[PDB]
Design a protein around this ligand. Structure first.
Ligand SMILES: Nc1nc2c(ncn2[C@@H]2O[C@H](COP(=O)(O)OP(=O)(O)O)[C@@H](O)[C@H]2O)c(=O)[nH]1
Ligand SMILES: Nc1nc2c(ncn2[C@@H]2O[C@H](COP(=O)(O)OP(=O)(O)O)[C@@H](O)[C@H]2O)c(=O)[nH]1
Lengths: 310, 312
């Protein structure tokens, strides 16, 4: 029986990794279980479009089809009386026309300049499928779900004759930091880093993640804890690096803005934080948390290592 | 912030901690929507199944026979069949058998969910192919808590953070600035964990003794919830408190037994001069009572554990 502790800044993907464990080892999501997330998908979806639109204002930008001005105001009024767990084709229509707007899509691409759900685009596009009244959220839909984790979530599953007891720690900064403390001496830690946070001006979000990793990695609490590093959201990174310069996050970066090199660099910047390199090793994997195939492959490796290290 | 309140739910398990949690959602936020409830259809069924199963499976250990020998058939199916309107049938019939009912009445002899009768006596409306469980049905569900559950709610201009730990031991101390502890006690447990050392009540007492006197919570208000008083109100009429406190010489009446049990718990406070215990007789499943109780709880927190910040 092993105790794995998902760690890392919010939105790095701890939760998504939990679901993948469910989907990959125990059973997954019954058409029944999925139905549960209908309200979350709607919530996320509406949240995504509102954010983008409410951003057009600040970033000073006009809608494509001048008429979308009506749908904009409509969006809000309909978001208020929204009966969670169900979305009206009326609202479904408002979002749809807005998402297909020239100026709105322009704001969407200027996404880094504000806060926007990673899943924003994924849901919005599939809006036709999701707007249906009988719509049953797919496993991917569930995986793309974004819900702030509170308290500590604990999942169980057996893999390779091993009883895994995983832990995702939500809660505020301090008590979280304090909960981590009562987690000193865990079999393993899977620290997640959202690679796509390099170009975000949230200190830098990436450096923040780094600072956090530095603490966990060189912390006396985990001197016998397999520090596993998930350089996650590699997909969003790839689509992003070809437009945004890694320099934004690392001015001391001489390489080129290409997935391979930049990714490699980020991995370097994190691994370099490890002080006791001769004593303890960092097991890294570039991941796409939402990608089940990727995560199974990756978790396979994590297990193997876990097995040896003990 | 001064208007931040950290609440920790403690107690023995099946003592009503999560029921309080569920209640905080129903009272201070929205409650369980038609959809959300539908989510619990399964647990309500499993709860129901393991309950009737627990009864039958116990008839044996207690040398009990079915009323009408015809049920022995349904007994067989129940197992080799585990909801279908067929299952609903084997249940209803078994739930009516005199012998079963008699086994159900000796529940203290074995382990049985407290919502057993509730569900079973409502099996019809429940087994309905178009069953949408009620908040109450949700409230009566039983499902082990894992990890740490957290609930946020604003009430009386206070921002509450309530925690329920899933077993729970060194994690209770893993909290900082805990404003208050709501310790739950299952009153109806007096006449019955594992018949190992002491009975549930004494277990709970050990638990409370440990917490009530812990110096880590010296600045934490100790709220005691003598819970499941509704179930307690019934058992005291047909089961002596002596089963739990052999030295008990009082009458087996709600009022007297309840007071006694309160005393046994409050006596444990080894710091009567400095630390006060705020006791409440509750029915975690009763939304009305919970809010009433919780309203009193906050006034206590406001009036005893908060800086002069404006609420009092
Ligand atoms: N595109 C993409 N999205 C991801 C990936 N991992 C997580 N997400 C999404 O990013 C958001 C945050 O994920 P979550 O697990 O909640 O992060 P957490 O707060 O660290 O637990 C959710 O919408 C996830 O579905 C990924 O690798 N690629
Ligand atoms: N009738 C009745 N049932 C209760 C009461 N409190 C809790 N229950 C039930 O007792 C069972 C266990 O409660 P739960 O909150 O899970 O206890 P926990 O293990 O301390 O969290 C559930 O079926 C609850 O619905 C009560 O006050 N009256």
């Amino acid at each position: 029986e092993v105790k794995l502790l998902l760690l890392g800044a919010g939105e790095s993907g701890k939760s998504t990794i939990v679901k993948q464990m469910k989907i990959i080892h125990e059973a997954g999501y019954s058409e029944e279980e999925c139905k549960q997330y209908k309200a979350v998908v709607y919530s996320n979806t509406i949240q995504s479009i509102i954010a983008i639109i409410r951003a057009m204002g600040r970033l000073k930008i006009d809608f494509g089809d001048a008429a979308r001005a009506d749908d904009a105001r409509q969006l809000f009024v309909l978001a208020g009386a929204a009966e969670e767990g169900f979305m009206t084709a009326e609202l479904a229509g408002v979002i749809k026309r807005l998402w297909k707007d020239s100026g709105v899509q322009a704001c969407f691409n200027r996404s880094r300049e504000y806060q926007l759900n990673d899943s924003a685009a994924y849901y919005l596009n599939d809006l036709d499928r999701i707007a249906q009244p009988n719509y049953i959220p797919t496993q991917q839909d569930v995986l793309r779900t974004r819900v702030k984790t509170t308290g500590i979530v604990e999942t169980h599953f057996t893999f390779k004759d091993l009883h895994f007891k995983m832990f995702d720690v939500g809660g505020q900064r301090s008590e979280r930091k304090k909960w981590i403390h009562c987690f000193e001496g865990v079999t393993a830690i899977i620290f997640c880093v959202a690679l796509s946070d390099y170009d975000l001006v949230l200190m830098n979000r990436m450096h923040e993640s780094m600072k956090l990793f530095d603490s966990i990695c060189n912390n006396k609490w985990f001197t016998d804890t397999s520090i596993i590093l998930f350089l996650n959201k590699k997909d969003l990174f790839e689509e992003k690096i070809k437009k945004s310069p890694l320099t934004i996050c690392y001015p001391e970066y001489a390489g080129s803005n290409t997935y391979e090199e930049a990714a490699a660099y980020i991995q370097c910047q994190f691994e370099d934080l490890n002080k006791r390199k001769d004593t303890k090793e960092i097991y890294t994997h570039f991941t796409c948390a939402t990608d089940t195939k990727n995560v199974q492959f990756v978790f396979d490796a994590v297990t193997d290592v876990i097995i040896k290290n003990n």
